[PDB]
Amino acid sequence: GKAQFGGQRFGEMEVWALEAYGAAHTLQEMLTLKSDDIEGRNAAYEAIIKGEDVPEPSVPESFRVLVKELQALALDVQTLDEKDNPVDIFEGLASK
Amino acid sequence: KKEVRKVRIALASPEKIRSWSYGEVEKPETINYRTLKPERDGLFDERIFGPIKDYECACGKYKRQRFEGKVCERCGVEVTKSIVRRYRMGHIELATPAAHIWFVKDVPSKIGTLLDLSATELEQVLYFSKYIVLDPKGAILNGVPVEKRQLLTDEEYRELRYGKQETYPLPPGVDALVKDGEEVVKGQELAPGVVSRLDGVALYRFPRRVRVEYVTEPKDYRVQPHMNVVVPEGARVEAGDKIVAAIDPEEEVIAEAEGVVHLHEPASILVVKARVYPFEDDVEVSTGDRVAPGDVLADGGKVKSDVYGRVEVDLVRNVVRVVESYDIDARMGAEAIQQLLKELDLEALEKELLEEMKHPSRARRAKARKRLEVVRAFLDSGNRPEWMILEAVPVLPPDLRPMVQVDGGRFATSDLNDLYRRLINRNNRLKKLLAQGAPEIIIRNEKRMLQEAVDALLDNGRRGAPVTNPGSDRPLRSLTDILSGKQGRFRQNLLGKRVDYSGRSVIVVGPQLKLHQCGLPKRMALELFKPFLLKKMEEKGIAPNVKAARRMLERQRDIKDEVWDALEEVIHGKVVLLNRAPTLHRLGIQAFQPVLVEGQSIQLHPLVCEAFNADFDGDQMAVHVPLSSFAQAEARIQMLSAHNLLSPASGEPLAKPSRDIILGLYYITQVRKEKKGAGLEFATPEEALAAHERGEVALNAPIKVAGRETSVGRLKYVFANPDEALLAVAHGIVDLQDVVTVRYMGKRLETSPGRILFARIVAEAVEDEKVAWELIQLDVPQEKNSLKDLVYQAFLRLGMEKTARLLDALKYYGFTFSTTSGITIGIDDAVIPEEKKQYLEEADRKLLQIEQAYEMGFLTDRERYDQILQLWTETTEKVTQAVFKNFEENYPFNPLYVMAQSGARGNPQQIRQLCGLRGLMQKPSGETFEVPVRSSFREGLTVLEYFISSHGARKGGADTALRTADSGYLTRKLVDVTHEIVVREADCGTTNYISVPLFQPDEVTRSLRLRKRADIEAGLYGRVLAREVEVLGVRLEEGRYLSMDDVHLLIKAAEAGEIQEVPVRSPLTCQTRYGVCQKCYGYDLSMARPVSIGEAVGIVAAQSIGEPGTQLTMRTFHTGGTQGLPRVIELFEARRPKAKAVISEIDGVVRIEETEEKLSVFVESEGFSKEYKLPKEARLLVKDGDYVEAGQPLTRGAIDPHQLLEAKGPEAVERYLVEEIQKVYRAQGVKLHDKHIEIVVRQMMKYVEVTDPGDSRLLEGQVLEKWDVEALNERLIAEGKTPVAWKPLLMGVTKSALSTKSWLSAASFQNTTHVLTEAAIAGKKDELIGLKENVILGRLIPAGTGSDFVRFTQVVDQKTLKAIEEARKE
Amino acid sequence: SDPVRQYLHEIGQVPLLTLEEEVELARKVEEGMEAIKKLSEITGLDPDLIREVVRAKILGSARVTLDPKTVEEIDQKLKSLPKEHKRYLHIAREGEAARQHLIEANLRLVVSIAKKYTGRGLSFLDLIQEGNQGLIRAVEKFEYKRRFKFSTYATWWIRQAINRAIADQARTIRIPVHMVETINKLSRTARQLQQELGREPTYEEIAEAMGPGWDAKRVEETLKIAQEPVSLETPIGDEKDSFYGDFIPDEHLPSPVDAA
Amino acid sequence: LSQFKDETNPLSSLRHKRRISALGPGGLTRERAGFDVRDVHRTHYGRICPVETPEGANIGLITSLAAYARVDELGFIRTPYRRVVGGVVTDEVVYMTATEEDRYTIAQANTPLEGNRIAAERVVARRKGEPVIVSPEEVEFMDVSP
DNA sequence: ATGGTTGGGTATAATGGGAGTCGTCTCGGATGCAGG
DNA sequence: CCTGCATCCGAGAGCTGAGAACCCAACCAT
Ligand SMILES: Nc1nc2c(ncn2[C@@H]2O[C@H](COP(=O)(O)OP(=O)(O)OP(=O)(O)OP(=O)(O)OC[C@H]3O[C@@H](n4cnc5c(N)ncnc54)[C@H](O)[C@@H]3O)[C@@H](O)[C@H]2O)c(=O)[nH]1
Ligand SMILES: Nc1ccn([C@@H]2O[C@H](COP(=O)(O)CP(=O)(O)OP(=O)(O)O)[C@@H](O)[C@H]2O)c(=O)n1
Ligand SMILES: [Mg+2]
Ligand SMILES: [Mg+2]
Ligand SMILES: [Mg+2]
Ligand SMILES: [Mg+2]
Ligand SMILES: [Zn+2]
Ligand SMILES: [Zn+2]
Structure with missing residues (x-):
């Protein structure tokens, strides 16, 4: 919304159009650096303010929310590397 | 940090839940009512979930960093970052086990299938309506011994338990x-x-x-x-x-x-029914003890019990009465279900089901396979079935269920907090009440409510009334409600997001812009490029540092002049993305170079409006700013407007002249015709010249002189060069539409100065005179089709840069000439022909006859209605013909006629409604009125006629409103079925192909006629030749891409009988995994060249099919005198038609046997003779004694695709589906290549069903992917076993999408609960092959620049390359 | 479905009682209580422990903090009483059975009392369960010697339990019992003042009618503390596409501008 | 049904006060309403405007009261007609419901007149919504105005 | 040492609830019933 | 015993913008 100084919604069909163009990097920017990659958007703003190029994106926070909500339904959702070993996308903040 | 490659989902054991949690929440308290701090052991406790403040405990002992990992002794809060409050889980220890509702209510029930319990039986047991027995202990019920897994009601159990x-x-x-x-x-x-x-x-x-x-x-x-x-x-x-x-x-x-x-x-x-035993001394067993026959009862063992039962010692009569009962062990609820699930041995059960799978019964085998699927999923995943019953309930982190203070000072909460409170309250009351030894009834009630509370927490509103907050009827939002739906997490926050660096505004026409430019408001650019602007102003002397620049830019009156110059410096060379909703195709987003303008409106180029489907009656557009070098390069190279001139769906120009541009070009390129002379005779030119000079012959009259057709203008005005002719035009000597003689290109052309001017315009635009002369058609007025063909040919011959330059030139000159042409619309421009009156009066004659033919008896009612309707439709057609004939003969420059002929605006029906008459109208029931609207819009309608037409107008509006949703749904289904198909390799190496026919059979006369050229172009253009073709002394080699000229050559050759079909590669016969190859796909239709490796052709195909359906299919319908979208949806879903026709399953000759009451058709082969009994009212396409092939229709109507699959095979179904889908789009006038439908159909035919498992572990009737079974068969041949035998299947787009391997895409599509529960039971591992999964993960999609084929490319200059070798040369 | 009908069916499957049967059952439970205290003083063991073990034996192994071996060994240890002492055990067991039977028979009184407390933040079944707890307490503390009917003494305990449940579980943010009754009395005084004045009272009138120690600031503070939070999922607008939480920004995590 | 009043101009408020809605508590649902309830019925003539309706998902579900229409005490919309006897148009005006209207032959308001007698041998009329051509004697009622 | 918060008690008799919802349409699978 | 045939239940249905008892006494917290 304009009253909330909000941003435009990049919905499903816009993502379809970007995919049809083959613009992988623009779409990844829209998904992470501009919406909900917190450290990513912070680093991007700092890099632009300092004159460098924007850094590589990370996992968006909405995926972490999805994982946490799937755990609430007693479902073990786990991300694995190339050798099927667990990869911690929470940086260790949720491990006892 | 290792990259993530796979995501696994599986069942969670109670040990797993307890390992996740940081502590158990013991109380339903959320926060303190007076200090607003979390309550101890509550749903928000900092001891369990983490601190609210950064690096500071609750009691304030520690208020600094360096204390990470240590827990304060006073408060119990670990000192760490507060963000951990959105990651850390909790848990609740249930007093009694509860079932996870997903595994109970999702039909077929997984638990019920495992335990061989029906849905009603599980409903009875879980919710405390009947008992289930374990270890019957030799109890007798109604004379029959009780066996395990038997259901006892409350009274039946009570009688057996107590007597x-x-x-x-x-x-x-x-x-x-x-x-x-x-x-x-x-x-x-x-x-x-x-x-x-x-x-x-x-x-x-x-x-x-x-x-x-x-x-x-x-x-x-x-x-x-x-x-x-x-x-x-x-x-x-x-x-x-x-x-x-x-x-x-x-x-x-x-x-x-x-x-x-x-x-x-x-x-x-x-x-009572009991045994009695007197005693005279102390007894041994007290009241409430259960005994067996032959046990010590009283008198020190003198008397003994003889039956099983319960003892009560009546001390008043000093007698032991043993009521005949049993020690039966029957239980009810999730505790009993969990006891049953624990005891289950999966290997023995699997052996029993494998033995059962040998039954001749088809239904019993099917049910055994249904059980075996679940059993084997559990066995392979390693999950224990008892984990399906919850003992510990996980608790979501508090930050995802917040309790926050609104700006008004009030608190806002999530429904999850209330659901957790309800669950905790019921659990605590159950524990308290269990501690008091309460009777069984109250315990049953409490456990019932606890199970219902768990159900409400997991899935609210599934069984019974949903839980609502007091004072409201709104159902509480459970976890499943959060996860799924259009409003759920997947579709609302993962497949689409709100973004930064974006804006929107109203759009206005930008006629002075270039094709690659867009007008952007100054303030919009200031807000969009703010960080780059801050850097630029800090670099200059505008501000000392970034903070000062921000403070200056935050106040409007504090902005200066040099910052605008800095902004102009910032955006130099950069592009922005413009998007208009709905984004039906990929050209709904385009990249433009921003030109800073005053005002608040975005300025849009006229030539991109058709691609955007935008007009200027209030439309708005969104603006986005790509940030990095990669994003800017992608936008400038791939998504720039000037680089996208051809449609990805048809290959035809999409950026092309329209509206005013067409009108002006047509106005200047049309020739004047006059009737004053009308074919007079002259022997010499001079007498004709004198006749014109004296005023008897018009300049453009078609006279004949000396045996040659000519005009006075051709003889009188002969110009040496175009410059002279245009100078004469500038002096008013001749008009642009007059036919004169001009010397051009060394030849003497009888043409008009306007056509010469158009040729010069094209030649100067393309900077090439010979090519421009080759491209244009000089001797015709320039209209929509000719201009589109010119744009396409210029593209082919010259390239995108020169084509865009020519487009800009055409736009400029079309606007300029439309301004001064004098095009206007007055009431007299709707010319009403005289014949119309006659045409009406004559009709008023025939009507009388019809009435007479009905008033005397030679006509019934239906026939009279039909004849009246036919008379009126023929009269309307005559009026239309008269109107357009009058326009062509008397007013060739009439504005309405010019607009309709040039293609700028309007079609003949609207012109007739304006001039001749509106015609017949339809009643709301769908039937026509008897009287037509005989007045046009110029004459003015009467009140009754207006009200009559209102029905059709309203019906058209409703048609639009309620069908656009169905078409959007179809587009989404196509996207979710084809999103994984990408161009992945140069050549798959296959030798299979398809044969595109050039002659279509006819139902009438049963003859082959050449197909429409548009159809052949849609089916042949851009494809790769599978085999060599020799036609008209021309060799088309193998591996050749068919250009448009090649398609025309093939059509020309086929018209001479030299060729009947064309063999081409196709996606239907491609062998690439999860996609296609370059040769089997063919051209990139938007570039008229072979497709690049890495193109996401599945999304392109889905958009190409979906876009025309959204608007142009049965746009504004005009109420004037199994079809459309429903037929297309039926074909894409493999629906069985209701008007289904009858096909022949086998070969043979036809023998129709018809009696006065019934009709049948016998197909007599040499081996067998089959029969088909048909309604007498049915239609027959064959005759007695004719020959029909297998799968050939015998009746009119839609063919069932599955029966055709059984009859003829897979290729016939592919061809049938493609052709029948193309029929609907062709009827609407939509050009669309066969490749997209071929891709979707290839996805439709992805699966097979096992008929004979052979020496594999597969089961009979098991559906699985064709690729997997083919690979399994190949490996079996390598090992030396018998192959698996399978038959192809045909599934709709919905079921094909929901049957995919990736659980992320299927979960984000539809039916989230079922997909998630099946994947969790199976322990499925997602390999992230498609686009949707990578979008959900926020990764780089494997398409375009993210393709593995191109994304590892390196770039280096010559200087660095050599010295790197000089290092290696050492 | 419809769990209320299922509970009503199960509760109606148990027949009612007459005065004679009621007094018989109460006398038996009274003698059972006297028997367990007599046994506890004889053996020197905690009365609660022996009551729990005796009731565990009366229920059976179906009712699983005391290991089965423990309760069984205690049961055999009570089998060492010569005479005039096993009578205490038998009387206690019959009293426990009487307690169970009386509770089952009079659960309908709990239903009747609780059916007029609906619509106050707790569902009907929760009210019924809290009333059942109160009825168990009343059965525990009933004295039949007074010849008073069972319902006369049970009703007070049932109503006390129900009112306590409303005070303690009705609100997502817990408010103590004294503040809850203060809020109810404030609301009642406000409505009487509205009835008398013919309009909404001002804070001065409510403070005056409360009594000594009540002023307008205090009533304003009470009314501010008595507000219940709204849902983050409240639908905003006519169409089913906007929630309340769509208008709530995060003020905790630093902004990108702040971080730099 | 209680809506924030639209007062951009006086005509906006006047339009808002005369709106008829098929939605609301105990009404239809926007997304599942079929063509049948959104169609201009033949009985809408003179009672509900066939033109003014919102484009989009609400087409046919929100409509407007006709200019001369009046809702009676039972809730049925009535429209006025002039009584004609013996081919002479009178000034008596009768407000009628759709059921009562179904029983008569009603002439168009633009029927030519001399004084107040129908001066036309062929009269365009409605019978149960069907357009017909009748003789002046068969006419029972006439429209008040377009 | 003070308020704020929590646990316990009241004795004629009382003994099975109450709002609600009826104008979508199709489609696909699971299932019980009818026939042979 | 098999089969087909109504029957019932569940899951879908375009995008963007905006909008109601009272009292009394003991007991931890700060
Ligand atoms: N993708 C898209 N594009 C649309 C749509 N509809 C119009 N366009 C474009 O806009 C141009 C001008 O169209 P319009 O001449 O119709 O003007 P408008 O802006 O739509 O305004 P209204 O005449 O509707 O006035 P209002 O007072 O009723 O607006 C308030 C009420 O309208 C409705 N409403 C207002 N705004 C929108 C909106 N953005 N989206 C959807 N519904 C909207 C809504 O129901 C609201 O509650 C057209 O040409 C198209 O390019 C649409 O549905 N989707
Ligand atoms: N719900 C909607 C309504 C509209 N639209 C979009 O707005 C355009 C114009 O609709 P419109 O009805 O404003 C005019 P149009 O049909 O072009 O006009 P004419 O025949 O009277 O000249 C459509 O083509 C869609 O792209 C949409 O996406 N969703
Ligand atoms: Mg528009
Ligand atoms: Mg338009
Ligand atoms: Mg001359
Ligand atoms: Mg509108
Ligand atoms: Zn601390
Ligand atoms: Zn291939």
């Missing part, structure tokens, strides 16, 4: 006919009006009086309700002993002497 007994009351004043302690047979009356109904011993309840003897004479003692009798019936008493104990010591009844004691006048009788 049968009843109580019969006795009215006051009426005694019984029996004694105390005697056995009673069923039916033995105990009173004059009381009759027993069960067998067993009967005992008195509350005798009213007691008779005490004295050693004789008797005595009576009254027994009041408040005092009780102690002495046994018929037992002696001693002096001083008590008989009737009372509340008051002085009121007790004390025996005076020795005598027997008897009890009489009972209040009721209790008849």
